[PDB]
Design a protein around this ligand. Structure first.
Ligand SMILES: Cc1cc2nc3c(=O)[nH]c(=O)nc-3n(C[C@H](O)[C@H](O)[C@H](O)COP(=O)(O)OP(=O)(O)OC[C@H]3O[C@@H](n4cnc5c(N)ncnc54)[C@H](O)[C@@H]3O)c2cc1C
Length: 375
């Protein structure tokens, strides 16, 4: 008796799903390949639509205390500093969308999310190598020679998803012609230029950009992440070190505020971004996918983790409707209730002009996931 869910991947999507599903009364364990838990030294942006999901988890208030609450998102021209858009966030967002827009330290958010999972149910050092849906249950084999069995398996295992591979076979090669540079800035370097350093700003030019925001309400730590054309990635790491000289050449011509940020860094890392992504895969048999395993996308709108967390919330609602004994109905309802919004996000990402002009972002931030009728 008593049915079991195995989740592969303890990233933001897998850890959200584990929390929501356990809080709903399901029996859930999580299997993560990393040998240890790492707090990523990076920021992340979380819109009101996802703060409403952290609310269900009991984490919204804590995240509000930890994060920065920008009053606006500014899009600015990279060369001139002209204001291309002034998107109201802050108290306007709280009233209009029903929750805060925050920017926050991603590693600390991630730790808080894993700490909401029942102790004894998250297993590190478990890299899935083989999975077989035997028809009435699924067996999972890990690289350390252990295994586990479950009634359904959630593929929360990211763009390199092994669940996706077991279903579709080996994915065609995808190359990388662009990178994201990442840096955290603190210090007198930050204090010296605090008057010109706005809380949430995207600096744009013809073929590249730099996004910048604070990670905490103290505004003592300032983060940037870029998107920049780059030669094909052939390094073994998921990242490599970059340098100020690299960044200053890539951002030649940008406004003095951006040059000040580059000069203020101590350590920059570079991350490969894929040129292409496959079409969504939602479920097959006893396997269901969420987040970057399901609908990998270019990072143009920076809503990927938010979409993974929305997936987790909607999947939980659908399993609450059907129970685990009727997983095929749940998995069908999940896809039916997510695919159009995922497709709108895809189409707007393709245009790559999100908040470049003074547009109304309500369709993203005002979305009411728990209000949607599953039908
Ligand atoms: C430059 C950039 C900026 C971004 N900014 C934002 C932002 O501000 N806001 C936002 O919402 N999103 C943002 N995103 C998108 C976001 O990072 C991703 O969409 C999100 O991480 C997807 O979460 P996930 O849980 O689906 O996958 P992941 O975060 O990739 O997690 C997958 C997990 O599965 C594990 N795993 C993989 N293979 C296996 C295996 N075989 N066995 C076991 N475990 C395995 C991995 O180790 C990992 O822990 C950005 C992305 C980029 C590239």
């Amino acid at each position: 008796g008593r049915q079991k869910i195995a989740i592969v991947g303890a990233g933001l999507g897998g850890a959200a799903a584990a929390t929501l599903l356990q809080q709903a009364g399901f029996d859930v364990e999580v299997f993560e390949q990393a040998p240890a838990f790492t707090r990523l030294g990076a920021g992340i942006q979380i819109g009101p639509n996802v703060m409403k999901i952290f609310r269900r988890m009991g984490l919204e208030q804590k995240l509000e205390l930890m994060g920065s609450h920008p009053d606006f998102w500014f899009s600015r021209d990279g060369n001139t500093g002209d204001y291309l858009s002034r998107i109201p966030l802050g108290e306007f967002a709280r009233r209009e969308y029903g929750a805060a827009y925050i920017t926050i330290h991603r590693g600390d958010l991630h730790a808080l999310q894993i700490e909401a999972i029942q102790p004894g149910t998250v297993h590190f050092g478990k890299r899935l190598e083989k999975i077989v849906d035997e028809g009435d249950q699924v067996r999972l084999d890990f690289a350390d020679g252990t295994h586990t069995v479950a009634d359904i398996v959630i593929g929360a295992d990211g763009i390199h998803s092994k669940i996706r591979e077991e279903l579709l076979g080996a994915e065609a090669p995808i190359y990388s012609g662009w990178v994201a540079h990442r840096a955290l800035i603190r210090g007198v370097n930050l204090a010296q230029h605090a008057d010109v350093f706005e809380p949430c700003v995207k600096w744009w030019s013809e073929d590249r950009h730099m996004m910048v925001y604070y990670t905490t309400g103290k505004r003592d730590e300032y983060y940037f992440v870029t998107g920049v054309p780059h030669e094909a990635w052939d390094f073994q790491g998921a990242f490599v070190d970059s340098s100020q000289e690299e960044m200053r050449a890539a951002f030649e011509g940008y406004h003095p505020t951006v040059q000040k940020l580059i000069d203020a860094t101590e350590s920059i890392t570079k991350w490969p971004l894929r040129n292409r992504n496959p079409l969504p895969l939602w479920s097959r048999g006893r396997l269901v996918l969420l987040g970057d395993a399901c609908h990998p996308m270019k990072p143009h709108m920076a809503q990927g983790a938010c979409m993974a967390i929305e997936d987790a919330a909607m999947l939980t609602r659908c399993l609450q409707e059907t129970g685990l004994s009727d997983h095929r109905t749940a998995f069908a309802l999940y896809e039916a209730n997510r695919k159009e919004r995922a497709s709108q996000v895809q189409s707007v990402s393709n245009a790559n002009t999100w908040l470049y002009s003074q547009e109304d972002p309500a369709w993203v931030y005002g979305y009411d996931l728990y209000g949607q009728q599953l039908e």
